[PDB]
Structures are given as structure tokens and as C-alpha cells.
Design a protein around this ligand. Structure first.
Ligand SMILES: *Cc1cc2c(cc1C)N(S(=O)(=O)O)[C@@H]1C(=O)NC(=O)N=C1N2C[C@H](O)[C@H](O)[C@H](O)COP(=O)(O)OP(=O)(O)OC[C@H]1O[C@@H](n2cnc3c(N)ncnc32)[C@H](O)[C@@H]1O
Ligand SMILES: [Cl-]
Length: 418
């Protein structure tokens, strides 16, 4: 019973120093556990790829998995209060049953709400904010075990949602909702980079509510374009690429059965926004990930930089996805303060092969003020990274106020707060 267990992240490339994952079965136990522990980090669903959740030797790694997972919809207010351990699959199911919906979802629904918003998680769409952007309140169990509630309108709120878990344990969050809506998902193959000029690029990325490009960085250009269209908006013709003949997966060769329905068949928002169907339930994945988030105005220049080193990127690549994100108010969001283009890389799980490629890619993106996704693999030096966040000092002041001893600051966060 009392023997050491090995705790890892989802992909298994990160092994935590913790010999047990503490799962308090009451809020009273959680408050006592936090108050009584010298250093704490929280584990969500483990879909980070780096040491963000690592509490260091002697540090406590805790989870909310032992507490009831509550999803409490207020239909009249169009809000939902959700436990921080609730995953988006369940959140979406429950709000949909109440006739309501989120404006966006990530690619795969089986990821915790608190863990997702902690790092700047997003989907696509030029007018769609990050997942954090719909949060209107957070409830934190702070270093001494007491609760602090921070709501939109509070001067502190800009640092309170996407906080890298550095303010305390987010026990619940409240999110704003809109009426449930229907969508169609239309996939296309072969969009050239040649002739993808500023106007065409803008048109393509704005052609539906959420648009992604996929490429293997092998033949020039893009292998796929995914349009997730709301049925309550116009769909113009899309001459720029060929309509897909078969159901597609982001990663060539992987099973398209795993993916959400295509060929433009209408279905509910939560069955179209993710790339992956709720029924697909992998307990781990053999992949690494990196993603770089840049000012949207640099999209073509960045894409051209990548194209120039495509022979370097391809050998260790499963797939690359290009997305857009609306400017984020959250101080630590990689989309902070600016409309954003994101370039995501799903790598083969070969750390030694991938790291040199990551470094080369980062060098290529320096001219475009690229901020890495906090949950993914990156090697941007700490000082250079701090320089990319205008309101970092404001964030550090907030963390200092809520957690003066840095109970929730680990090595990962310490590099950011330095
Ligand atoms: C594994 C995976 C990852 C995502 C994607 C696909 C899957 C297979 N894609 S992608 O397109 O393939 O990249 C996502 C996407 O579509 N959009 C994205 O922006 N990101 C993609 N990711 C991202 C993955 O979303 C994340 O990196 C997340 O952070 C979501 O979080 P998890 O809960 O799974 O992660 P951790 O357990 O590692 O926690 C992350 C951080 O947040 C903390 N945390 C967790 N719970 C809490 C609470 N309750 N309170 C305070 N802090 C909390 C951790 O301490 C850690 O710092
Ligand atoms: Cl091309």
C-alpha cells in the first residue's frame, strides 16, 4: 500500500520526483494539505510536456481527482461553475444539455479546465479568444489554505486565470456561455504556400469560424486545411484547395476514426470544435509538442522562415498545425495583447532528436517575437523569455501578494518570475 508509485505526465516523457500523487477527498483536507506543505504543484490531466507540474524534491504534487467533479450551469445567467479538475468533454456535455455552449475548444476534449487555462490553451479562429478568455471568476486555495476569489473587473484578474498555477490551487472557475450552435467541418487537401499572399492568407484563415492548416514540411506548402463553420454563418466557396476525398487525421497514417465528423455533416458545436471525438480516450500518447505564438501580422514571414528550414523540421515531425487566436487580456497568455498566429508541432517522441530541431526552429522565429506555449516543449532562454511579456512584473507582484513565500513557485515558474 505505502510503496512508491511513479507519477508521469500524459505522454510519459516527464517523470515527476513525487513518490505519491496526493488526492485529498475533501476541501477541508485540501486546505490542510496546502497549508501544511512547504512547496506545492498541482497535477491536472498531465497534457503538458515539460516540468511545469514538477514540485522539486520534497515538494508536494497534488490533484483534485479525489474531490467531486461538479458542473453547475446557471441558464439565466449563461454561466457555468466548474471544478478545476473537470475535463472539457464533461463540461461540454453538460452545458450542451442546457442549450448552451462555449465559443471554442482545444483539439482534444479530455483535458482539465484549470490545467488548460493555466498555460494559454486555445483552439483556432481569428475572432476566437483563448480558452481562458471566457473565465469570469476563479476560486483559489492559497498558500495558507484560505480561499481568495478573483472576478473579472478586479484589477488583479488579468493575472488570475492563466497563472501557470503560481497563485494557488484553482478549485473552481466560472465561465460565460452562449446559446448552443450547430457546425459543419469541411476538410481540403493541398494548399500551396506559393501565392499565399497577405489577402489570400487572411481569406483562408477567416473562411470559417475556426480554421487550421496542417503540414508535414516535406513537399512545399500545406497538406490540409480544416474549416469548422457555424451553420448560422455563410460558407463561401473555398477554391484554394481540393475538397478532401477521405476522412482525415491531423497526422498522416493515424486513424481518422479518432477524429470528429467531416464532409460538412452538421452536428453540435462540441462535436465539431475538437479534432478528436469524445469517444477517443487514449491514456497516453507517443508524442512531444512545441507551439509558438506570434503577432498575426508576422504569419507569412514566419511561415516563410519555417519553409526555408523545412528539411530540418520534417524528419522529427508527425504534423504541424497553423492556427489563429484573438488578443488575450491575460498577462501571461502567449496571445497576450495581440491578435495571434500559432504554429504547433507534434513531434515524434524522441527527445534527443527533437531538442536540436526545437532550438533551430526557435532561432528562426526570434525575428517574429514568438512566445512558446507554456505547456509544451521549448528551449527559449529564461531572460529572453521574460522580455516577451509586457505585464510580467505586474504578474510577479500579484504572485508575491497572494503567495509571498512562493509555495506554488517551482523551478519552471521561478525562471519566469526572476
Ligand atoms: C496532450 C495534448 C495536449 C494539448 C493538445 C493535444 C493533446 C493530445 N493540443 S495540440 O493541438 O495537440 O497541441 C492542444 C490544443 O489544441 N490547444 C492548446 O493550446 N494546447 C494543446 N495541448 C495542450 C495541453 O492543452 C496543455 O498544455 C494544458 O496545460 C492543459 O492542461 P493539463 O491539465 O492536462 O496539464 P497539467 O496537469 O500538466 O497542468 C498544466 C499546468 O496547469 C496546472 N494546474 C492544473 N490544475 C490546476 C489547478 N486546479 N489549479 C492551479 N493550477 C493547475 C499545473 O500545475 C501545470 O502548471
Ligand atoms: Cl507551395
Amino acid at each position: 500500500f505505502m510503496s512508491d508509485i511513479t507519477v508521469t505526465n500524459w505522454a510519459g516523457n516527464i517523470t515527476y520526483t513525487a513518490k505519491e500523487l496526493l488526492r485529498p477527498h475533501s476541501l477541508d483536507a485540501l486546505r490542510a494539505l496546502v497549508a501544511d506543505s512547504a512547496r506545492v504543484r498541482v497535477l491536472g490531466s498531465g497534457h503538458s510536456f515539460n516540468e511545469i507540474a514538477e514540485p522539486g524534491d520534497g515538494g508536494v504534487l497534488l490533484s483534485l481527482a479525489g474531490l467531486p467533479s461538479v458542473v453547475d450551469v446557471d441558464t439565466a445567467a449563461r454561466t457555468v461553475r466548474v471544478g478545476g479538475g473537470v475535463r472539457y468533454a464533461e463540461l461540454a456535455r453538460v452545458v450542451h444539455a442546457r442549450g448552451l455552449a462555449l465559443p471554442n475548444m482545444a483539439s482534444l476534449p479530455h483535458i482539465s479546465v484549470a490545467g488548460s487555462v493555466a498555460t494559454g490553451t486555445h483552439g483556432s479562429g481569428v475572432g476566437n479568444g483563448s480558452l481562458a478568455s471566457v473565465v469570469r471568476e476563479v476560486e483559489l486555495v492559497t498558500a495558507d489554505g484560505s480561499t481568495v476569489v478573483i472576478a473579472r473587473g478586479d484589477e488583479r484578474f488579468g493575472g488570475a486565470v492563466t497563472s501557470l498555477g503560481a497563485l494557488g490551487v484553482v478549485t473552481s472557475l466560472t465561465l460565460d456561455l452562449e446559446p448552443a450552435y450547430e457546425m459543419e467541418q469541411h476538410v481540403f487537401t493541398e494548399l500551396p504556400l506559393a501565392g499565399l499572399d497577405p489577402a489570400t492568407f487572411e481569406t483562408v484563415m477567416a473562411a470559417a469560424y475556426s480554421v487550421s492548416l496542417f503540414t508535414d514540411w516535406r513537399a512545399p506548402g500545406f497538406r490540409q486545411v480544416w474549416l469548422k463553420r457555424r451553420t448560422d454563418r455563410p460558407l463561401d466557396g473555398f477554391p484554394y484547395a481540393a475538397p478532401a476525398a477521405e476522412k482525415m487525421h491531423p497526422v498522416p497514417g493515424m486513424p481518422a476514426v479518432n477524429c470528429t465528423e467531416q464532409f460538412g455533416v452538421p452536428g453540435p458545436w462540441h462535436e465539431r470544435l475538437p479534432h478528436f471525438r469524445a469517444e477517443f480516450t487514449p491514456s497516453s500518447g507517443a508524442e512531444l509538442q512545441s507551439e509558438y505564438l506570434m503577432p498575426r501580422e508576422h504569419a507569412l514571414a514566419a511561415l516563410h522562415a519555417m519553409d526555408a528550414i523545412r528539411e530540418t523540421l520534417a524528419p522529427v515531425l508527425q504534423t504541424c498545425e497553423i492556427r489563429t487566436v484573438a488578443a488575450d487580456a491575460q498577462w501571461l497568455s502567449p496571445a497576450y495583447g495581440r491578435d495571434t498566429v500559432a504554429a504547433h508541432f507534434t513531434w515524434v517522441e524522441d527527445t534527443a532528436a527533437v531538442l536540436p530541431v526545437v532550438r533551430r526552429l526557435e532561432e528562426a522565429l526570434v525575428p517574429f517575437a514568438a512566445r512558446p506555449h507554456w505547456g509544451k516543449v521549448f528551449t527559449v532562454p529564461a531572460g529572453e523569455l521574460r522580455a516577451l511579456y509586457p505585464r510580467l512584473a505586474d504578474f510577479g507582484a500579484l504572485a508575491g501578494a497572494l503567495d509571498p513565500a512562493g509555495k506554488f513557485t517551482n523551478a519552471f515558474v521561478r525562471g519566469v518570475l526572476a
